[PDB]
Amino acid sequence: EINDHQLSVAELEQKYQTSATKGLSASLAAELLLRDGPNALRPPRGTPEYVKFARQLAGGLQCLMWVAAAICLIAFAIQASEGDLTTDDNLYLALALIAVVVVTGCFGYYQEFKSTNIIASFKNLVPQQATVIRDGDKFQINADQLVVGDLVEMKGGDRVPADIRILQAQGCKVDNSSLTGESEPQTRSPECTHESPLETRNIAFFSTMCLEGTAQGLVVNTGDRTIIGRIASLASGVENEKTPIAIEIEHFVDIIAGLAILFGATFFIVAMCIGYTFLRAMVFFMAIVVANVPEGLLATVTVCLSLTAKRLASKNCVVKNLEAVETLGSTSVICSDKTGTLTQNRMTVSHLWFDNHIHSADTTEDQSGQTFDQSSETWRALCRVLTLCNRAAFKSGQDAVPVPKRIVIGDASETALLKFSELTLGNAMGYRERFPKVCEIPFNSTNKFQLSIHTLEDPRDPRHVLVMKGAPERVLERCSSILIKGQELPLDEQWREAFQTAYLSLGGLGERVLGFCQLYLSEKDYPPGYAFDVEAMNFPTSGLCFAGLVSMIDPPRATVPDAVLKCRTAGIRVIMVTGDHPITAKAIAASVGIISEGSETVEDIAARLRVPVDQVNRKDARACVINGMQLKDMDPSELVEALRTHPEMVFARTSPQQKLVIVESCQRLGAIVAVTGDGVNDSPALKKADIGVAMGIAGSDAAKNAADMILLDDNFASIVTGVEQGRLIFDNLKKSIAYTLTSNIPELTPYLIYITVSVPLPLGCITILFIDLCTDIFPSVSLAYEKAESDIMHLRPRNPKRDRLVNEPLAAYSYFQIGAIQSFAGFTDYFTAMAQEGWFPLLCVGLRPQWENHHLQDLQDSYGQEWTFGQRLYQQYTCYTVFFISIVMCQIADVLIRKTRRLSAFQQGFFRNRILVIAIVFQVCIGCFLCYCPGMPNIFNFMPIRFQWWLVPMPFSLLIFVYDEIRKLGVRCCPGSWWDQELYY
């Protein structure tokens, strides 16, 4: 790349077999097109859709659900050697496990397809073109047809077609705001300025836009060999990290798996001691390890994550993975690109100087801010000089698009002036067409002014307006009076000096100061119809009357200055990463709030104190601006110390890779980093981030493709929604998972006892399946429609290593306390239903052999009555159908108690969550349908049940409510160490 802008035209036109005058040949240019391929970025070469659904099938919970299904099928072999009966339960359980993983994967694939298509519903499929000189002729072709060495002509308003070396140019200015963050329009000259082609001036870049001027050059690189291409392809090398929620789900599948292995090993050893054969004791070990696995928790988690993505979509924020919906609530540091993401990347007029006042304007797009004084006599003249002396014009049919977003045909300087006249005055072009243009001299260095002589509106004035605009010091050397407070006062040394003190004040803010002067021409010296001339001046090029100054800059976006504030009030550290020069960075960091008011760098303390920066101690500075040249000289230890030592940080003149280094360092130190971005300079550092947000309109396709979140409206306020909802689901999933976890023990303990005491089987697999995959989905999903238990948006960011989604207190509580109460409810109802129909609890002990024997059709009960296999099979089904209702009625309490973790249900409100109550009703309705529908006795294992056993568990449910209310009042009333350490989940 270095030895292509340093060459001479003689050596270049031999390298590429072209001419700087005549261009490529029609033949060679069609050969190079088949050699080097099209001048287009290479899309990802791999998109197989089957390997797209396969990825959805893989996850931590999915891995457990997969290994447990394999365990079930291996059990269906250990239990096929010894021929057993009703063994098809294992097949149902394993098939349901695999079915859940499959259908949740299908959901995920569908809702990623939807997102990608939406993100492509805003993309521009209009071919970008170029003007090519081939065989000596200038014609217009598609940019994908250009080949290395072709002669290209660039005009104002034309996107640069390739990576070009400037051979000749007249005042050409391009917007390298994708490669660099350079808001300030950059000049392109045919002469070598640097050798890093990023900072030299003889090179134009692939996806940059020619703001103003005219140029002619040689294509030095096409395709993925352009600077664009190598940055976007480096972005392919970086590999996205696991989302935080994925790490926490993996820690959860560590907890449940370790608990399963402990449980199964304990009861395998116990079974060998009891006298069971090694093979059958190991089948029971397998049964325990499957019982710890949750069949439906993946479904409810996926549904919750989808319901908090629909919300964000309605706030014009689309997520690619369902996992991104949480990631912004765990974030501790936000890294943001200055241009485009934080600013508007649109030169608008910011300030003015007239009537000896520095007026300030509304730089916003919503026009929310406060405008200036628009009543002075001077303002109307200024709004005439700026309106008339503007050869720019809006494109056709944009009268519904907002004025800032409209496409204008004109210079960077003139476009802002035209939009200013449109907003302040309205119908700027129509107003300009009330004053014809007799003569004009727009762009000459000798005169340095845009002169336009117009004729006044009324024929009452044959007088002629002379409006001219240009650099203020080129204006004042040609003016003699100043318009102040309804008067034409003369230009004393004082007025000249005040003009200078305004030029040098509005230009110290990093703004484009432009000066405007005007004069009224006589009806006698210049009667209507004067024939003006330029070569021999016949009009006044001197003795004009100053109107005012107008200054333009790249302004901050509307909602950004408040968005970063509400982020910072949540403990999030906002850091800026820009490629623009340091002064602009500090300005748009103070404005938006990254740098607090009253904060000063080590270089500012050295001006307050007039001390060498060396002696100023660093710890006394809370801000710092670090350039790329001195970020490349800095080792890891220096970065960690400088990052913590100065809390508010602005990184300047960074590169694609330096941003990646910053993100990597923060992540290594133990932070969850989020990158907000636009343009190809952020595609590297948007992948490595835990969440990459891209502007959906102003962002380049590379940064919108290497992202996880797309803001379709470019509203930077959506970030401060993504945190709170993202926080809520964490706290609202910690609840949901908790509820579901409780169901393991009231299901396991039946079976654990069916072998330990040899009682008839209380609960069967076809019924635990109905508990997990039908009755307990609506409750847990409803638990995410809850509301905040604190000012979640003021809480400091969650600590990754201490604060976890599932911790040992949560699982231990949900199992050993609550699920133990549920197991007792089931056992009471089991012994009760059996005793009412003839089997007292003592006889139930050890009865399973004869209960399950197919050869005993005369088994006699506690009353001495003799039962066949079918009669007591139906009664076993009754034990099933009462343990079923025991669990569901003891979990109608669970959903309510888990709707809060610290506050009581009375305060929040029992019925405040609507979906929760709908789910409670649906739970009881599915129970009644399953028990009392004709045929369910043999379709499934549910039968009509007496109405006394519905109420045996209700005491237990109210015990659950009482226990959780007391253990929640224990934490809130007494925020003591004992309760919070031992009894808080």
Place this chain on the structure above:
Amino acid sequence: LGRTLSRWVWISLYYVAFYVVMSGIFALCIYVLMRTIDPYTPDYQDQLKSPGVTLRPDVYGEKGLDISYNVSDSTTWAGLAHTLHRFLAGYSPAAQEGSINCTSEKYFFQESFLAPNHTKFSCKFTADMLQNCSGRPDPTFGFAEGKPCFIIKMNRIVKFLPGNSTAPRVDCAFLDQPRDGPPLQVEYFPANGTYSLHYFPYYGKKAQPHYSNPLVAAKLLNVPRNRDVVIVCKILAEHVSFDNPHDPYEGKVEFKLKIQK
């Protein structure tokens, strides 16, 4: 996890306390449950709608009762006969001694307990009623002559009445054998196959400790030799149903029989 050894004791005490609290609740619940249970009468007895029918000798190789034997080999029917005999060792004259000689043909209704230790009186059944299908004079119960004696018993349901009009009778007959082969010729002992109506109602083991179910026997005379046959023994009574497809042993017992000579 060893977070703190001293704190471990306090939370261990909390967990043992929680479990013993709920264990006391559970124990109280089972005891109040058992105090709500009458010991002579089942509280609900829902699934005991119609009675089960059980057969001796009971031999299931697979897929139900399959009794196949050779008359010329004592080892093929000795176990069958011994199961019959050890079954009837409690239907013995001096082992059924705790009951009373029952001569009331219509019924045995008893509303008050008139036996030692607040027990009730029970009806009697000895092996003699099975005149030919007893150890007297054939200790093979008909199996050595190719005329086997299969004894049919009905399951007992507390205060269950099977119909007053006549007595329940076992019709044993060939299942799907309408061929030129003749109907199963059976001689039932007691004659006419009647379970006498004074063995109903059953009032529970606490009420009638010495109660023994009535029995009927079928001497299968017509059974062909070296042919696998299938026989259905149905009990015909008002309150007895034999059409249940989820209990093939409701009011009927079906068995496969092969006598090989």
